[PDB]
Amino acid sequence: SMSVKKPKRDDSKDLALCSMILTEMETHEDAWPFLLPVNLKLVPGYKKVIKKPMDFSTIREKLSSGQYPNLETFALDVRLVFDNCETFNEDDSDIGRAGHNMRKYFEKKWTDTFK
Template sequence: KNKRYKEDDDDDEDEDDNDDEDEDEDNNNSEEDNNENSYDKTQDLLYPYPKYDFDEYINQISNLTDSISITEVKFYKILKELYDDERSKEFWVAVDLKLNPKYKKIISQPMDLGKITNWIRSVHYYSNDHNAFAKDVRLVWENCMTFNYDS
């Protein structure tokens, strides 16, 4: 769960402990939501995909001249294009195995775009390994086609 969902869980636990504290927290949370968060929580629940700031990632490494950084910038630009495409939302998180219990039986190597992004950020793709990156991105689409073949 991300932090927003954890806070929602904490609010539920507080109700059981003390109603007065809960009212204060609800008032504080409402003020915080109005001030800090301009996003629509309903949209977040309908499409709970991670938030990435690819422009920031690119800016952080674009001044570096080593080949790994240059490759990372290319990877991030490709992922940013995909991220900005509304049709890709479902591919940024792992398939929910509770909603799709047969998925693990059909798909031997699950992959999602969020996992790829996190791997790049943790230097999983070394050097100029364009092939590993391309293979994993293709795997996202191949898994989708394989799992939904009968649909």
């Protein structure tokens, strides 16, 4: 509350460390469904159904231009990528399996880097 604060967690490396995680996600062999925004002209249903599209390139641009206020808003966009994927793709599909694999990969890196 006013003039009453928990001890200050060092957040000075968060930007660098989120960049490194995002690099690792970009270079994973199962990243291909997530590298670029879904083409809303060419994929019937996507625009109406997926209210907030998100992809790795869009996260990279937001990250590089100071549009994440803190490491939690960064995790929220990464998870959005996988939540969108599950919304639109059957679990038993190459892209559906890709999304599960990447979400796992991300959540481990996230825990090991920050928890």
